[PDB]
């Protein structure tokens, strides 16, 4: 059998944190932006969000009324991934979060860094996503995403964030990153259970071909073999991406992870 994550509060590296048991509420926010008709148009991001929608509702018990999907092919304004709609949807996603909830966030679109002009550090950069209206309202930055989606969460609430944009863990101010090689990044800590999956690589605008590889690989890995440890998830993602893309899978987290534990969805 598998080893499920422990249910007691954990101490690790001067941090208290709790793994989600994934027995709580299942809500998801899925964002696919093709920037349709613009010079930064992409072709597959909306499809990426639909593919994650189908995976979550078919295999993970998510109900359609519990998923907000924002894609820019929509004629209804409230379904468009405008910055203000993304912010309101991120607030919806975490409202009411409890320990053991299973919240899901997916972003497929452009990503990069912008100068952190108020940041009390020269050459300091914000890590950002690009809402469809970014040419008129700017990006949505790490600080905001972290403040809405992470800082709010109770101990033991899961947020599983899947980025198709090749962000690093800095996009959600996560202190830990794991690869198939082990710990590749480690240290205001959260006790929640925030994990992030993303590929290693204003940096997507000329490299749009690596966008979308992670959700495709994730769905493929999890469909072929639903039983995964965090270790095998990263190995199987690595195997799924190795030829077709240069990006490598990276698991970022708000807390240390014993990779031998089961990765529960
Ligand atoms: Mg700033
Ligand atoms: Mg930052
Ligand atoms: Mg694609």
Residue numbers in the entry: 73 to 259, 310 to 323, 329 to 392
Passage from the reporting paper:
A second preparation of CgMCA-I at maturation day 4, concentrated to 8.2 mg mL−1 in 10 mM HEPES pH 7.6, 150 mM NaCl, 10 mM CaCl2 led to crystal growth of CgMCA-IMg complexed with Mg2+ in 0.2 M Mg Acetate, 20% (w/v) PEG 3350. Regarding the specificities CgMCA-IMg, and as opposed to CgMCA-ICa, no β-strand complementation was present to stabilize the dimer which instead shows contacts between helix 1 and loop CgL2. As opposed to CgMCA-ICa, residues Gly84 to Gln87 show clear electron density and form a hairpin stabilized by two short β-strands (βa and βb). A disordered CgL7 loop is still observed, but the segment from Asp330 to Gly335 could be constructed. The electron density map revealed the presence of three magnesium ions being hexa-coordinated. One of the Mg2+ ions is positioned at the very same place as the samarium ion observed in the crystal structure of TbMCA-Ib but instead of being coordinated by four amino-acid residues and a water molecule as observed for this latter, in CgMCA-IMg it is coordinated by five water molecules and Asp214 (Asp189 in TbMCA-Ib). Interestingly, in the presence of Mg2+ the distance between the two catalytic residues is 10.6 Å, against 8.3 Å when in presence of Ca2+, suggesting that the presence of calcium forces the catalytic site to adopt a proper organization for its autolysis activity.
Metacaspases are caspase-like homologs which undergo a complex maturation process involving multiple intra-chain cleavages resulting in a composite enzyme made of a p10 and a p20 domain. Here, we present the structure of a metacaspase from the yeast Candida glabrata, CgMCA-I, in complex with a unique calcium along with a structure in which three magnesium ions are bound. The monomers CgMCA-ICa and CgMCA-IMg both contain a p20 and a p10 domain forming a caspase-like core in which a two-stranded anti-parallel β-sheet from the p10 domain completes a six stranded parallel β-sheet in the p20 domain.
